[PDB]
Amino acid sequence: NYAPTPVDRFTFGLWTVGWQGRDPFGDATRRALDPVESVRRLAELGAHGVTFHDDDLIPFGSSDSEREEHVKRFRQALDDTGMKVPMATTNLFTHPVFKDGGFTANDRDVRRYALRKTIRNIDLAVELGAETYVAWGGREGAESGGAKDVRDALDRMKEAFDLLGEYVTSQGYDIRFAIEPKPNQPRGDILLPTVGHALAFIERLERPELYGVNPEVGHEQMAGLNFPHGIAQALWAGKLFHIDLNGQNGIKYDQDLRFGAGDLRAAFWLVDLLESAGYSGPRHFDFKPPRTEDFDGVWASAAGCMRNYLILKERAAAFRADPEVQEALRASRLDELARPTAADGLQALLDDRSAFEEFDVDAAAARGMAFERLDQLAMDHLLGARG
Amino acid sequence: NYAPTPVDRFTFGLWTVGWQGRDPFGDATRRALDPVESVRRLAELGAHGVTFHDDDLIPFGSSDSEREEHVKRFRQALDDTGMKVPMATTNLFTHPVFKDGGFTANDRDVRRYALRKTIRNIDLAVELGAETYVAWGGREGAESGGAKDVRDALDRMKEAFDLLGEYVTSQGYDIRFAIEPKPNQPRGDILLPTVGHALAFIERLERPELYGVNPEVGHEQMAGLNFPHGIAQALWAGKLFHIDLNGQNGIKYDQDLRFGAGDLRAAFWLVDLLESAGYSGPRHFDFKPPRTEDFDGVWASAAGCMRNYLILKERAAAFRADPEVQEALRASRLDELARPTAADGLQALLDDRSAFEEFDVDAAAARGMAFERLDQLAMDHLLGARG
Amino acid sequence: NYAPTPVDRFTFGLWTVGWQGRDPFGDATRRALDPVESVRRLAELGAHGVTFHDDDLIPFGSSDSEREEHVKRFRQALDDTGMKVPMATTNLFTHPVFKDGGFTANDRDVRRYALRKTIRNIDLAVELGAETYVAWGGREGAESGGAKDVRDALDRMKEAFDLLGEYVTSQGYDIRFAIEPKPNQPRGDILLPTVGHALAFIERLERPELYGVNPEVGHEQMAGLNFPHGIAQALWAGKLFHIDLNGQNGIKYDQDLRFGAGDLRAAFWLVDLLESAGYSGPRHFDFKPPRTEDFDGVWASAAGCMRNYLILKERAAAFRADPEVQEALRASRLDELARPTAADGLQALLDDRSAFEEFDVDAAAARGMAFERLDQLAMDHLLGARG
Amino acid sequence: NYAPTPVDRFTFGLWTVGWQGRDPFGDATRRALDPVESVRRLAELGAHGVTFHDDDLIPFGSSDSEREEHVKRFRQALDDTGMKVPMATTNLFTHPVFKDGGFTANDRDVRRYALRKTIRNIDLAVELGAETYVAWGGREGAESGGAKDVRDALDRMKEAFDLLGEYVTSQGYDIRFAIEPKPNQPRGDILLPTVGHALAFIERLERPELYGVNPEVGHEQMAGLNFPHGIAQALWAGKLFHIDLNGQNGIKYDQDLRFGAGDLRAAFWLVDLLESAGYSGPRHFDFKPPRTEDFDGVWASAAGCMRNYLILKERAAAFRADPEVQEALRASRLDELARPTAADGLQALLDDRSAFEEFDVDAAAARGMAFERLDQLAMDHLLGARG
Ligand SMILES: [Mg+2]
Ligand SMILES: [Mg+2]
Ligand SMILES: [Mg+2]
Ligand SMILES: [Mg+2]
Ligand SMILES: [Mn+2]
Ligand SMILES: [Mn+2]
Ligand SMILES: [Mn+2]
Ligand SMILES: [Mn+2]
Ligand SMILES: [Mn+2]
Ligand SMILES: [Mn+2]
Ligand SMILES: [Mn+2]
Ligand SMILES: [Mn+2]
Ligand code: NA
Ligand code: NA
Ligand code: NA
Ligand code: NA
Ligand code: NA
Ligand code: NA
Ligand code: NA
Ligand code: NA
Predict the structure, then answer these.
(1) Is C365 helix (H, G, I), strand (E, B) or coil?
(2) Phi, psi (rounded to 5 degrees) for D187
(3) How far apart are alpha carbons A193 and B196 in whole angstroms?
(4) Distances, alpha carbon B276 to alpha carbons B8, B272, B322, C105, in Å
(5) Cβ–Cβ under 8 Å, residues B178 and B211
(6) CA nearest A169 in B: which residue?
(7) Is A141 helix (H, G, I), strand (E, B) or coil?
(8) What positions of C carry a catalytic annotation?
(9) Are C51 and C85 in contact (CB under 8 A)?
(10) How far is the C-alpha of A302 from the C-alpha of A4, rounded, in Å?
(11) Distance from C-alpha of B57 to C-alpha of B70, rounded to nearest angstrom
């Protein structure tokens, strides 16, 4: 039961199942995986595709001949399995040169290098068929107040993204960008810390249509925010270009638990929203099998990500299809929320005594919302306990 | 020392010093204050002005004659003291009719009433000389996932703000709107939970130039975010129309401590930013004297808000003026952060071997940022411990 | 399905279903309930009993004749329904006199009054058959560092609890005390903020056997802590005298959502632990139907608390009884965790080369824990998705 | 100004200034330091001593001859500088063998090895003159609910600490143990997550007098708790055997900022408490110079830890010595908080009409606490802005 299919579009970063287990306090617990291995194992589990940072696929500093051989082997694995590559990204965070940032490093020479490193990888992403290029500015930020003038840093971040937009336009590429917010870690505070801040920034770019967001479940939860609500705002803005799925237990370091772990009810409401809205992009997992696990546990954890999505999809669909739930949604006036407040226009509203002089506020205030009954129907559907 | 002056533009809500001390668990500890009393006492402390919700100035449900008398008494107090009214707002949160929201209530009749209540108070705000009209949507949100379709709620919130913009345009008013984000409390999650989400929403309004943000120190800190960073993004966007100053100890219920309490170093960096950027708006305190206090403690707490701003202003100015700090800022390459990455343009960057093939990444990575020395100079300046 | 029974021992505070909906920003949305009404309605839902603060049952300041009549009516309702009263507590937080505390108020006269108010209610609790007397020191704490010397406050808190222990001993009562920790709210920081701090404090009382803890799901989660882990430590110490069940979405104001809401997987692990350990006390709900609800929603929310406990009980029992789970627990060495490290004793351990010179650390480190497979079996059982 | 002296007893872990800068996302930015270098540089800054994990001083897996040479070189550096070694600890977290714990690993063979590794290092600590042996159980915990039975784990943790107590008793050593709590990171939840939980656990050990706590500023703040309050409870219990000083910005990953950074006002209240209580132990810094820094920044950050302690010490002493503050403390009834509630005894309290029938609750409730004036005097003293 709950078998993944190609239409599910489940994808995984090479760095997810390939995470060797090094953490702030501990050495690696697993050997490095060949990307070819990961592609073949993920395909066996029913995944649709993989994603990569440049330096996951091609060791940093590789010669041109080494680069070609790494890409050739990877493409053979994709061809052998039918796996796709819908998204790629640049590693602008691991190497010590990026310790103060890539695009917003105080040192101008580093900013220029970061752009050249990204541009090289955009070319590769396009060659592999990627539709989306993600940017996670994990080093953009500060530990202290004097170290980073945020207005200047935002100017540099806009300059960088504008140059990348000019680049893809000039080459005729169809790829689009997706900015991944995170509030903190590894920097004390990261620039563009939430979906909202990233959406606001995009509106000030020269070609805003080329950029959207790549929100990650756990990153919004590291600020204690409601991830389904943030995804709803991204959808409302037309900017949900990609998504990263995982789990998180609240306001902690970024745990990258398998999807469904962490806040299970938020995972339910997320799947309900994505499916109801008809989100058509990859269901991408940015997760880490815990370092307690051997490789069998790696593949079990990856399988669990997909399984949990499919269980939640079933339960959310049953919730929305249940005539008792539909009745409860009407009892709670969800239908009214979807109707305009004043399609009659401002003057008609100003002239409407039913909106002011003759509005019976105490009668309105007496009406219950019936939200608790609705939520217990949702709980019963999630748990398969209807009756 | 540290005496407030009119040019400081310190303002207070009537509901701040007037808070009677009722909390989720406790009855009022202070009697209600007449707004006339608050105006006269605040003026004696050196405040510039006050702000109000409609229902702070005019008891809910007042007749037209009662409304006129309340406003007349208030205006006499303003005239007697020279106090100004730079900002006003609507109470769309206390009355039970607003239990599911004002502008985004599921019930359409409530949404229409909320708009009419706001419009009436915009007229009054203009008559009193206010330049800014704040909206704090404290009831816009949910405790459960099925209760509120966030895309529909954002449609209703946009409709409401668009109607208000049409209204002020039609009347020829110069007032502008400022949206106040908050992540949670009193709703389990509030819509537009951060400065970023509010900035992003504004970009989708029909007349975006009429709307900005009113960020509150403690509200961003309730999501664990960096308040100076968020203010920097608002300034970068040209949207810092007003600000609410207070203190908060991290991720808790909204404490509304006096300004300078809570995160003292964030208060320092905030004042440094506002003064450096030339922010010209009110320095408004949205705070609550703790319910442990009698009226003498109320006025001491209000005085403390202003005193702490003025101490921090002095220390931040001394930091920026110190030639040793200026040298440290150059050692940390803050000057370089302010210079364009690639004013030479994209083609020149692509052709520049110094940005890629000839970039010595290990030499760049060896350079220290000297951020710790800079931050200890900042600490020494804040504490008056230079030497 | 999932029908409560008397053996379930589900109990509710009068103040839960009776909460009128006043919050930091909003007036009451529901009329006050007569305790008689609440007893009869809760009995109809299958509850076992109720609990009370003194001032929930007897209006503050009542005459002796008024007190007798309130108690008489309440006892008739208990007799009419078969409902029990297993626990009572004192309200040392609502009245303004308690604004700086009860037992740890700086003013000695207030401390003495708080003790007398508690003692009067202990007598009533015993008359009603209560086995446990809870103390929630919600006003014990501070908003500022100079206001409360915590060592002195702990001396006063110990003195108070020691006097209460002397009192019950002197009267021959069998009741025992349960201290309810909370980290913050309504005070900026509350003394004894977690289960651990309360357990540690109890060990320093003169008669430690008379005191245990009353942990509340949401209160531990307001510090981001793992509630099942804290309950395990209380059980390990022999101190889980009572428990408060509800839901919470992380590090926020105390939400008091119905049980099962908030962190659903933590609710699952909690029920698993209570049932596995054979906890025999009340399953008490300290929750608040949201103020959006009318009375039908109040009773739906209360019913939901019990329903969710019973669903989770079923799923946790099925998890523990499944031979595949039992095999997975052995694969993860849970059996070994339960066996002594060194029952052979210290000298034998020091002499055992297999524990040091001949311990193959790399072979040990290669063994996977298989925790992800185990956790996905747990997820499948919770969701009823085995297969 | 603010020059460290030997009587200040400032100490640093080898792993602090020696941290190479590897974080969850980034490679090392600094070369490894020879412990001899660190000892000599710290002495030049005015430090009193250093501390070590076994594997900081002796590379894991060293032969006996290698071990002797590493210790010999280190002792020569201590002798050359006058530096002391007041504390040592075991690394039971970095090596992959400890991925599920040391003392509470599910695998019994790992638990036995962890004990033998610790015992070997206790012998070395005693030879170097250490008075305290710290245990930070960073791997004791879980990411999932089924992986760790917490009651069984607490049994194993007690067994381990009891064996270590038997060991030191049998050898006649004067060293004592200090347990370092942390709520999470690197495990999803760590056992003994706060000072309170550790204090409670110690009370159940066979020889409780041999064990205390080593609280760390940032770790309590990772649960949003008040660090000075927790230190006060440890002092009240007689269990503050050692302390780790650093800074933290709230509920995030463990930042280990230099002391004084993070929550500056909490640092002030901490220093006030330690100095007022006469804490006589090391002022130990467990911090990490940010990875942005070169070695000059490492030593600047270490110097800053000590400088900030000394500034805060001066300001707290001036606060307590100021006759205006002493008057404000009396106005706020801090003197009364320190006096017994009922030294007259229980019967006298029960017979005292002034404590109940004749207690004027409304007159008592009218008295203000004057806490805001007191706190603004504290702020003025911290900032050196008296006047
Ligand atoms: Mg629709
Ligand atoms: Mg500039
Ligand atoms: Mg057992
Ligand atoms: Mg004393
Ligand atoms: Mn992540
Ligand atoms: Mn991601
Ligand atoms: Mn606020
Ligand atoms: Mn505000
Ligand atoms: Mn609660
Ligand atoms: Mn409770
Ligand atoms: Mn730490
Ligand atoms: Mn430490
Ligand atoms: Na700039
Ligand atoms: Na979209
Ligand atoms: Na709509
Ligand atoms: Na602006
Ligand atoms: Na005392
Ligand atoms: Na127990
Ligand atoms: Na055991
Ligand atoms: Na002590």
Answers:
(1) helix
(2) -85, 155
(3) 9
(4) 15, 6, 14, 44
(5) yes
(6) B346
(7) strand
(8) 53, 56
(9) yes
(10) 12
(11) 7
How far apart, in whole angstroms, are the C-alpha atoms of residue C213 and residue C241?
6
Do the strands B141-142 and B189-190 form a parallel or antiparallel pair, or are they unpaired? antiparallel
Query: Which of A159, A179, A74 lies closest to A125, judged by CA?
Result: A74
Cα separation, A45 vs A41, whole angstroms: 7
Residue with tokens 């229409």: B112
Q: How far apart are CA C356 and CA C362, in angstroms?
A: 13
**Cβ of residue C304 closer than 8 Å to a chain A Cβ:** yes
Distance (Å, rounded) from C-alpha D383 to C-alpha D316? 11
Of residues B53, B242, B284, B381, which has the active-site annotation? B53
Helices and strands in chain A, H and E counts? 16, 10
Which chains does chain D touch, 3 or more C-beta pairs < 8 A?
A: A, B, C
The pair of three-digit structure tokens given for residue A107, joined into one six-digit string = 């040192």
Alpha-carbon distance D229 to nearest alpha carbon in chain C (angstroms): 6
Collapse the DSSP code of D49 into the 3-class scheme (helix H, G, I; strand E, B; otherwise coil) and give the result.
strand
Query: Residue with structure tokens 């039992």?
Result: C326
Closest CA to B216 of B174, B178, B161: B178
A293 annotated to bind ligand: no
Surface of A (203-222) touching B: CB under 8 A: 203-204, 222
* Residue A231 Cα to chain centre, angstroms: 9
Q: Residue C124 contacts by C-beta under 8 Å, 6 or more apart in sequence?
A: C54, C71, C88
Rounded CA-CA distance D239/B133 in Å is 55
Q: With contact defined as beta carbons under 8 Å apart, do B188 and C249 qualify?
A: yes
CA distance D359 to C95: 14
Integer Cα distance of B234 and C52 in angstroms: 49
Active-site entry in D48, D54, D55, D56: D56
DSSP C264-282: HHHHHHHHHHHHHHT--S-
How far is it, in rounded angstroms, from Cα B308 to Cα B326? 25
Most C CBs within 10 Å, among B143, B222, B257, to test the C interface: B143
Cβ–Cβ pairs < 8 A, chains A and D:
107
Q: How many angstroms separate the CA atoms of A343 and D220, rounded?
A: 54
> Is domain D1-387 given the CATH code 3.20.20.150 in the classification?
yes
Question: Using CA atoms, how far apart are residues D11 and D287, in angstroms rounded to an integer?
Answer: 11
- The rounded distance, in Å, linking the Cα atoms of C201 and D197 is 10
Terminal Cα-to-Cα distance of chain A (whole angstroms): 23
Report the residue from A23, A29, A99 with minimal CB separation from D29: A99
Contact A350 B230 (CB under 8 A): no
Q: Are residues A370 and C293, on separate chains, in Cβ contact within 8 Å?
A: yes
Name the residue with tokens 């550790």: D198
Instruction: Closest CB to C1: pick one of A251, A301, A387.
Output: A387
Q: Which ligand is nearest to the CA of B233?
A: 16
What b/e string do you get for D201-220 counting C-beta neighbours within 10 Å, with b at 16 or more? bbbbbeeeebbbbbbbbbbb
3-state SS, residue B358: coil
Residue among B61, B125, B135 at smallest CA distance from B104: B135
Measure C59 CA to nearest chain A CA, in Å.
26
Q: For residue B180, say whether it is annotated as part of any ligand binding site.
A: yes
Nearest to D318 by CA among D380, D231, D229, D387: D380
Resolution of the experimental model, in Å, one decimal: 1.2
By C-alpha distance, the chain D residue nearest C144 is D375
CB A216 within 8 A of CB B212: no
The residue annotated as part of the active site, out of B54, B55, B56, B380, is B56
Residue A261: phi and psi, rounded to 5, are -70, 170
Count of CB atoms within 10 A of residue B368's CB? Answer: 21
Cβ distance B224 to A224 less than 8 Å, yes or no, reads yes
Q: Which backbone phi and psi does A172 adopt, to 5 degrees?
A: 70, 25
Does A143 lie at the interface with B, CB-CB under 8 angstroms? yes
Domains of chain A by residue range: 1-387
Q: Are D157 and D163 in contact (CB under 8 A)?
A: no
